[PDB]
């Protein structure tokens, strides 16, 4: 809204809020990212370190599908299954230990972040972390690998 914009309060002011000693010239400093090495080096080195120079190996035909691998932590693992599944756990005097399919929920790798409740569970996933496997074993479950 031009009504709420600043230009309405600048009516009558000669310089229109852009100084009068140095006028608002068209492009005093250079267009765009001009002078990354010259006359803007201080800014480019104190606000964008690592802008200039190459590093690493080139990969011509890169595909994100090959490296696609979503991760889920043990911090939020029972959220993938219904709450009644966990209700029917630590009960029945049988040791049901239900199966939670991570791939069905939409993750491939299971990570060890977070605390796991004391309830056995069968975790099926493509990849497992060492700490996540240790947590599952300590809780009393089993890690299952799937393709």
């Amino acid at each position: 809204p031009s009504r709420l914009r600043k230009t309405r309060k600048l009516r009558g002011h000669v310089s229109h809020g852009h100084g009068r000693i140095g006028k608002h010239r068209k492009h005093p400093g250079g267009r765009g990212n001009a002078g990354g090495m010259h006359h803007h080096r201080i800014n480019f080195d104190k606000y964008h370190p690592g802008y200039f120079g190459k590093v690493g190996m080139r990969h011509y035909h890169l595909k994100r599908n090959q490296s696609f691998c979503p991760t889920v932590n043990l911090d939020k693992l029972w959220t993938l299954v219904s709450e009644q599944t966990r209700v029917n756990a630590a009960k029945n005097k049988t040791g049901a230990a239900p199966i939670i399919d991570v791939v069905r929920s939409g993750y491939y790798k299971v990570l060890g972040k977070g605390k796991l409740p004391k309830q056995p569970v069968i975790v099926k996933a493509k990849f497992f972390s060492r700490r996540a496997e240790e947590k599952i074993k300590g809780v009393g479950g089993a890690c299952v690998l799937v393709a």
């Binding site: 595909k63 599908n65 696609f68 049901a96 199966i99 791939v103 990849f127 972390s129 299952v144």
Partner: protein, 210 residues
């Protein structure tokens, strides 16, 4: 000119983009036109499904998905042959047929054959002429339903099989997922090197004899 920690960006507005700006003020009119054309086609094919020909069960490449099931381009020739349907007759009956599809696994072939069997089971074939010849369905199942089928015919739904709670044994408890993964990766990396070393050892062994 940069000013006190702004993001470094490169807008792609150096060409004459204003001459090639494509507006979308015709979007609702285009939607209305497409809807009218779809309704006209549906009225053209009075008993035929609005969506069109049947589509096969197809899985996805690009292991990113690797699990989703979608509609295919058409039913494979081997699937038609197993189902006992001629490829040219399938086009006239309303079965999508493409001659490029392969068949590596038996599960997809059997699923598509079952889908074709179900489609032929619930297919009502009107006779060419009012007097019904052979292979034409009875007039009883023609007056009851002579309308179209809204949406895709026999829609594909990605269904998962539930697994009941198990009795996990000491072997499954002792399975070492991370160690197995690391060992498998190492074996994949070093399979060729091990084979080369074995070949060199065999060469040395046969050289010792001579």
């Amino acid at each position: 000119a940069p000013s006190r920690n702004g993001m470094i960006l490169k807008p792609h507005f150096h060409k004459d983009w204003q001459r090639r700006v494509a507006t979308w003020f015709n979007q609702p009119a285009r939607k209305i036109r497409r809807r009218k054309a779809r309704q006209a086609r549906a009225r053209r094919i009075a008993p035929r499904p609005a969506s069109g020909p049947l589509r096969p069960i197809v899985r996805c490449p690009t292991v990113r998905y690797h699990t989703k099931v979608r509609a295919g381009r058409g039913f494979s020739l081997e699937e038609l042959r197993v189902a006992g349907i001629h490829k040219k007759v399938a086009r006239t009956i309303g079965i999508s047929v493409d001659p490029r599809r392969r068949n590596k696994s038996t599960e997809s072939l059997q699923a598509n054959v079952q889908r074709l069997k179900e489609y032929r089971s619930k297919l009502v074939l009107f006779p060419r002429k009012p007097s019904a010849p052979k292979k034409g369905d009875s007039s009883a199942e023609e007056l009851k339903l002579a309308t179209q089928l809204t949406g895709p015919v026999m829609p594909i739904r990605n269904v998962f099989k539930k697994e009941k709670a198990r009795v996990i044994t000491e072997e499954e408890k002792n399975f070492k997922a991370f160690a197995s993964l690391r060992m498998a990766r190492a074996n994949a990396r070093l399979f060729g090197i091990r084979a080369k070393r074995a070949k060199e050892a065999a060469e040395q062994d046969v050289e010792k004899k001579k």
